[PDB]
Design an enzyme around this catalytic site. Structure first.
Site, PDB file in Angstrom:
ATOM      1  N   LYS A 176      38.792  13.864   5.094  1.00  0.00           N
ATOM      2  CA  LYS A 176      39.944  13.430   5.857  1.00  0.00           C
ATOM      3  C   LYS A 176      41.162  14.323   5.669  1.00  0.00           C
ATOM      4  O   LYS A 176      41.862  14.648   6.637  1.00  0.00           O
ATOM      5  CB  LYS A 176      40.280  11.982   5.498  1.00  0.00           C
ATOM      6  CG  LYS A 176      41.311  11.338   6.413  1.00  0.00           C
ATOM      7  CD  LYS A 176      41.463   9.809   6.201  1.00  0.00           C
ATOM      8  CE  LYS A 176      42.531   9.431   5.157  1.00  0.00           C
ATOM      9  NZ  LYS A 176      42.717   7.939   5.130  1.00  0.00           N
TER      10      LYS A 176
ATOM     11  N   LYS B  87      26.763  20.469   4.346  1.00  0.00           N
ATOM     12  CA  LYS B  87      27.082  20.313   5.769  1.00  0.00           C
ATOM     13  C   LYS B  87      27.194  21.665   6.471  1.00  0.00           C
ATOM     14  O   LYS B  87      27.735  21.780   7.564  1.00  0.00           O
ATOM     15  CB  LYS B  87      28.358  19.492   5.941  1.00  0.00           C
ATOM     16  CG  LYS B  87      28.156  18.043   5.501  1.00  0.00           C
ATOM     17  CD  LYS B  87      29.304  17.178   6.026  1.00  0.00           C
ATOM     18  CE  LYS B  87      28.883  15.729   6.205  1.00  0.00           C
ATOM     19  NZ  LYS B  87      27.877  15.408   5.150  1.00  0.00           N
TER      20      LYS B  87
ATOM     21  N   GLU C 220      45.388  16.847  -6.022  1.00  0.00           N
ATOM     22  CA  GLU C 220      46.112  16.273  -7.115  1.00  0.00           C
ATOM     23  C   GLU C 220      45.106  15.409  -7.903  1.00  0.00           C
ATOM     24  O   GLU C 220      44.192  14.804  -7.332  1.00  0.00           O
ATOM     25  CB  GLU C 220      47.233  15.399  -6.591  1.00  0.00           C
ATOM     26  CG  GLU C 220      47.778  14.504  -7.682  1.00  0.00           C
ATOM     27  CD  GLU C 220      49.010  13.808  -7.214  1.00  0.00           C
ATOM     28  OE1 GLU C 220      48.968  13.251  -6.100  1.00  0.00           O
ATOM     29  OE2 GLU C 220      50.026  13.831  -7.952  1.00  0.00           O
TER      30      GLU C 220
ATOM     31  N   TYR D 251      61.050  21.211   0.323  1.00  0.00           N
ATOM     32  CA  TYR D 251      61.458  20.925   1.713  1.00  0.00           C
ATOM     33  C   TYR D 251      62.982  20.820   1.779  1.00  0.00           C
ATOM     34  O   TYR D 251      63.579  21.236   2.746  1.00  0.00           O
ATOM     35  CB  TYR D 251      60.797  19.669   2.242  1.00  0.00           C
ATOM     36  CG  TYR D 251      59.300  19.632   2.029  1.00  0.00           C
ATOM     37  CD1 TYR D 251      58.574  20.809   1.807  1.00  0.00           C
ATOM     38  CD2 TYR D 251      58.611  18.411   1.994  1.00  0.00           C
ATOM     39  CE1 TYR D 251      57.188  20.777   1.531  1.00  0.00           C
ATOM     40  CE2 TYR D 251      57.224  18.372   1.743  1.00  0.00           C
ATOM     41  CZ  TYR D 251      56.532  19.555   1.505  1.00  0.00           C
ATOM     42  OH  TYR D 251      55.191  19.534   1.202  1.00  0.00           O
TER      43      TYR D 251
ATOM     44  N   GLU E 128      61.730  21.597 -13.105  1.00  0.00           N
ATOM     45  CA  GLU E 128      61.931  20.229 -13.511  1.00  0.00           C
ATOM     46  C   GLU E 128      61.528  20.157 -14.975  1.00  0.00           C
ATOM     47  O   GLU E 128      61.116  21.160 -15.586  1.00  0.00           O
ATOM     48  CB  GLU E 128      61.045  19.296 -12.674  1.00  0.00           C
ATOM     49  CG  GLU E 128      59.532  19.640 -12.715  1.00  0.00           C
ATOM     50  CD  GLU E 128      58.741  18.854 -11.658  1.00  0.00           C
ATOM     51  OE1 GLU E 128      59.201  18.816 -10.500  1.00  0.00           O
ATOM     52  OE2 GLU E 128      57.678  18.273 -12.001  1.00  0.00           O
TER      53      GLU E 128
ATOM     54  N   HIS F 259      54.723  13.617 -11.572  1.00  0.00           N
ATOM     55  CA  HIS F 259      53.951  14.824 -11.859  1.00  0.00           C
ATOM     56  C   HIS F 259      53.364  14.786 -13.244  1.00  0.00           C
ATOM     57  O   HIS F 259      54.068  14.506 -14.231  1.00  0.00           O
ATOM     58  CB  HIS F 259      54.841  16.066 -11.763  1.00  0.00           C
ATOM     59  CG  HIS F 259      55.169  16.445 -10.359  1.00  0.00           C
ATOM     60  ND1 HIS F 259      56.222  17.263 -10.042  1.00  0.00           N
ATOM     61  CD2 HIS F 259      54.521  16.190  -9.192  1.00  0.00           C
ATOM     62  CE1 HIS F 259      56.210  17.512  -8.742  1.00  0.00           C
ATOM     63  NE2 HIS F 259      55.187  16.875  -8.203  1.00  0.00           N
TER      64      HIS F 259
END
Ligand SMILES: [Zn+2]
Lengths: 306, 394
Positions: free
Chosen positions: A26, A50, A105, A167, A217, A259
């Site tokens: 998906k 596949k 993730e 972003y 961070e 995270h």
């Protein structure tokens, strides 16, 4: 031979040919479609068992080696579920795909420590991620999950341990008309394939990148290593403006802040120390994440680079 | 993170060859009795099993003082256990009314002739597992690092080749174990490393890792931190997760797969993205407010996650305003604006919402939020959002 040698594969462009691992899933499906819409050269993908099918009008292969040989892909983006993601990355490394972007993730840390072990002992494959949004060269190549419309080809190189914060920085640098040369999300995990210094090197050598925004961070010492790299390579005679924002000033110690790598453990990994280390390396740190665009803009103005 | 009772992590260690005090866990006063007998120990330690610290000087609602007792007499273990099980143990580290004690550990009491510190952890900086030890045991390793860095020893372990005998021996020697005890400790180190790998630990810390007068090497106490990402392959361990001492909302958020961390503020907030969430908490503080929580809806930003988030923040009575900042994710803004106004109406929230939505379909999103009739302020950017949320609370 040396892993640092593959740094250059970070610079995707209009000529980068991309395959998707986890192509029929998906997520792989959805971003592959967005990638095609953006203009990225997605040429096929793999899903074990596949192969021999087409999906989204493109060929599906059982292995990365077959996909690479049949399409000449130079990049792979991985959307495989965590239990199989390390095998997916190892397969790409074995196939010597120049650039592997692992979006996934949730990969076990132990799994990544193993992947990184192989990774550091070869120089054909550059890995970005896991748990990262990907890389984007505005108007030329998008590999990953970022919204393509906020980007504008321009002068600022952006490297970040955070997707959403990137972003912000893109939207802001697009609004002030600076635009972005290349955006790299190195991801939120503790063990990963590309750090800030890897990107800084590319940025400092890139004529198109006139300024750099570095977003970090809490957790680890990647920012502090980046400040060392800059003190050595960006403090004269060469000097590009570098602006930064470090998330987590107010984070409680000892909790993984979303995270997996965002944690102040053993009293190490705090934000203040990262800010201080960067300032001393010539970086202008914006205390506010809403001011990255205007901060780097003034740096350009000061230098008469507008 | 996963929380194991002392008896659970010790069981984990003993089932894996690591030497710990022999012990049994009891549900009843009577089982405590029979267990003390089975031990055949000169001296017995009876310990209430709760996660909070300060057990030693805590107090039960039965009136019994002390959550850890020593005795040579099995029947005393039974009598004391009867004054523990079913009662609440309060310590300088639990809520005021204590925590119900459902189980006690009955263990052989061992003397500690020497204490060292031993730890195995995934170290980002060393790209792998590191063996960290210090002769200076029983103390927080951080203090020891400040006062005496020279006494902290590290061995970077290669994940592919595993731990080397040489490494284990050197560490044992560095922790000051001698003669036969050095081989025993070197051996316990190898078993700890294997244990560390097997259970997907990010860290196994034994403090004290020590010896008993009878020349035994024992992991007297240990704390294990697990890699949450490994849950799919450590199902039995995660199942043992005790959530009976966690902040309710923390637990609820986990049912619905949300990263929720409570803070002491009154401005709630939800954001898609760990970085953005940290940055929001940060910018609220920079602008003079106190965030009520950290909440990451993740980048997969689904309408039902928004709705669950609102349901969660309904449980916090301190919340005076909610800052919603969403930028990113494959779902367009108009669908997010919808779930927001639906959440609001149906959960009947009355607090002001400061909303910052950025992405696809923002125009329509802004429309849905404006025509909702709800007390909703649409912010220009993050800074604007923080200032407006801060302006909305006491
Ligand atoms: Zn926050």
């Amino acid at each position: 031979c040396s892993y640092t040698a593959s740094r250059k594969h970070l610079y995707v462009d209009k000529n980068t040919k991309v395959i998707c691992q986890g192509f029929t899933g998906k997520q792989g499906t959805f971003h592959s479609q967005q990638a095609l819409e953006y203009g990225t050269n997605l040429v096929g993908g793999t899903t074990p068992g596949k192969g021999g099918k087409t999906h989204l009008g493109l060929p599906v292969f059982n292995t990365v080696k077959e996909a690479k040989e049949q399409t000449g892909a130079t990049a792979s983006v991985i959307y495989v579920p965590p239990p199989f993601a390390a095998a997916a990355i190892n397969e790409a490394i074995d196939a010597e795909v120049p650039l592997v972007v692992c979006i996934t993730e949730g990969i076990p840390q132990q799994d990544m420590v193993r992947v990184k072990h192989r990774l550091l002992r070869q120089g054909k494959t550059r890995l970005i991620g896991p748990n990262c949004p990907g890389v984007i060269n505005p108007g030329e190549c998008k590999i990953g999950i970022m919204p393509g419309h906020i980007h504008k080809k321009g002068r600022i190189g952006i490297v970040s341990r955070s997707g959403t914060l990137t972003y912000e920085a893109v939207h802001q640098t697009t609004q002030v008309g600076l635009g972005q040369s290349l955006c790299v999300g190195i991801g939120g995990d503790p063990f990963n394939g590309t750090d800030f210094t890897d990107c800084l090197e590319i940025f400092l050598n890139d004529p198109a990148t006139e300024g750099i925004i570095l977003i970090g961070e809490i957790g680890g010492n990647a920012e502090e290593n980046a400040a060392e790299f800059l003190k050595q390579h960006n403090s004269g005679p060469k000097s590009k403006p570098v602006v930064s924002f470090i998330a987590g000033l107010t984070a409680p110690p000892g909790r993984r802040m979303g995270h997996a790598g965002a944690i102040i453990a053993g009293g190490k990994g705090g934000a203040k120390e990262k800010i201080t280390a960067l300032q001393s390396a010539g970086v202008v740190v914006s205390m506010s994440p809403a001011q990255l665009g205007t901060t780097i803009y003034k740096e350009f103005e000061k230098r008469k680079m507008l | 993170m996963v929380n194991l009772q002392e008896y659970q992590s010790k069981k984990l260690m003993s089932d894996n060859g690591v030497k710990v005090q022999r012990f049994f866990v009891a549900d009843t006063a009577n089982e405590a009795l029979e267990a003390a007998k089975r031990l055949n120990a000169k001296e017995i330690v009876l310990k209430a099993q709760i996660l909070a610290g300060g057990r030693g000087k805590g107090v039960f609602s039965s009136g019994l003082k002390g959550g850890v007792h020593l005795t040579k007499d099995p029947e005393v273990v039974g009598q004391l256990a009867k004054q523990m099980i079913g009662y609440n143990l309060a310590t300088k580290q639990t809520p005021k009314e204590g925590v119900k004690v459902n189980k006690v550990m009955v263990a052989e009491a061992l003397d500690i002739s020497r204490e060292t510190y031993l730890a195995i952890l995934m170290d980002r900086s060393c790209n792998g597992p590191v063996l960290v030890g210090s002769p200076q045991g029983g103390v927080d390793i951080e203090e020891v690092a400040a006062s005496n860095p020279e006494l902290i020893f590290k061995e970077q372990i290669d994940i592919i080749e595993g731990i080397k005998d040489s490494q284990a021996q050197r560490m044992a020697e560095n922790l000051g174990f001698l003669g036969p005890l050095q081989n025993q400790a070197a051996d316990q180190i190898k078993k700890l490393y294997n244990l560390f790998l097997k259970i997907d630990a990010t860290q196994v810390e034994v403090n004290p890792f020590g010896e008993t007068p009878e020349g035994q090497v024992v992991c007297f106490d240990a704390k294990i931190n697990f890699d949450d990402n490994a849950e799919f392959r450590q199902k039995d361990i995660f199942a043992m997760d005790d959530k009976s001492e966690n902040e309710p909302i923390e637990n609820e958020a986990a049912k619905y797969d949300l990263k929720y961390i409570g803070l002491d503020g009154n401005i709630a907030c939800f954001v898609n993205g760990a970085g953005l969430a940290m940055a929001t908490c940060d910018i609220i503080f920079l602008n003079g407010g106190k965030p009520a929580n950290f909440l990451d809806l993740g980048g997969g930003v689904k309408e039902s996650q928004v709705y669950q988030a609102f349901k969660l923040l309904t449980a916090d009575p301190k919340v005076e305003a909610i800052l919603v900042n969403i930028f990113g994710g494959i779902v367009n803004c108009a669908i997010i604006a919808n779930g927001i106004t639906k959440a609001c109406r149906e959960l009947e929230l009355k607090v002001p919402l400061v909303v910052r939505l950025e992405g696809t379909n923002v125009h329509e999103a802004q429309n849905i939020l404006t025509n909702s009739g709800l007390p909703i302020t649409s912010a220009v950017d993050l800074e604007d959002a923080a200032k407006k949320a801060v302006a909305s609370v006491t």
